[PDB]
Structure 1
Amino acid sequence: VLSPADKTNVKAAWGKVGAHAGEYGAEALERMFLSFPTTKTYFPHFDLSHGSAQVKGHGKKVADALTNAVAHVDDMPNALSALSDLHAHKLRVDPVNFKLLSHCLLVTLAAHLPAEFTPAVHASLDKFLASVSTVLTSKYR
């Protein structure tokens, strides 16, 4: 479970992200497509090149889900319910992939948060992304 300290750590990190959440979402997806090419198999309909508006638009949606997850950190299952239906029953992204994107979101945060990305905050964020991931796959079977 997310501890009170984790919840505090996540909120302060995401707090400093602030208005750049969208941008960072898009960067994390780019990082993922390049680091882990198999993740591209979910996107044969997108132009995945650097700067792609489809990646920027998707990145903004991913980031807003996370902003929503942080704002309902005590109540994530419900907040993400529509997204967990959509991944379980339509997109059907293999659960392995959430770990890849989590790592890439963590890297993006690290690369933009020189003060805030302390060992403890890094620990809380990984927990928080594992947790979002878990909720997002909780309806898969």
Structure 2
Amino acid sequence: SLSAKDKANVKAIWGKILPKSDEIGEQALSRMLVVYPQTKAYFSHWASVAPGSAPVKKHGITIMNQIDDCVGHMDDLFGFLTKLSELHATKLRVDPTNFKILAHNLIVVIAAYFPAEFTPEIHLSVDKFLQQLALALAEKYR
């Protein structure tokens, strides 16, 4: 569970992330695909899985838009994500172990974009946030 202090930490860093949300999304998804190629299994219907390609850019935005919205929903991420959990489970059939892979790459991308602001305390809070978000996407499985 997130503390008050985790939540304040998340919102503060998202203050920096939001203006670069699309680029950050593209970077995170590009890295998950190239660095952890096990994840390409879900995306072969795309025209490309190369970093910065049009499909990767388009979907990076889609992902980040959702995560940006979660930041305003940290009092109940599981409720907020139910429909999205259902979609990944039933329609997309994504092995939920991949959610943490995405989380890891976003953390890498945030550090890279905001090295001064991304202290260990901020990093801890964001990791807590993203792990909960992963758990919430996993909630409606099985």
In structure 1, distance between residues paired with 2:74 and 2:105: 21
Q: Which amino acid in structure 2 is aligned with residue 92 of structure 1? A: R
The offset of 1:5, in angstroms, is 0.8
Aligned to 1:83: 84
Task: Say whether residues 1:6 and 2:2 are aligned partners.
Answer: no
Question: In the alignment, does 2:59 pair up with 1:61?
Answer: no
TM (norm. structure 2) is: 0.95
CA contact (8 A) 1:13 1:117 kept: yes
Cα root mean square deviation, aligned: 0.9
Distance in 2, matches of 1:38 and 1:20, equals: 27
The whole-number CA distance in structure 2 between the counterparts of 1:19 and 1:91 is 30
Q: Equivalent residue for 2:42?
A: 42
Aligned length: 141
Q: Answer yes or no: is the 8 Å Cα contact 1:65–1:80 preserved in 2.
A: no
Taking structure 1 as the reference length, the TM-score comes to 0.96
CA distance in 1, matches of 2:18, 2:90: 31
The unaligned stretches of length 5 or more in structure 1 are: none
Say whether the 8 Å CA contact 1:84–1:137 is kept in structure 2: yes
Residue identity over aligned pairs, in percent, reads: 50
Matched residue, 1:33: 33
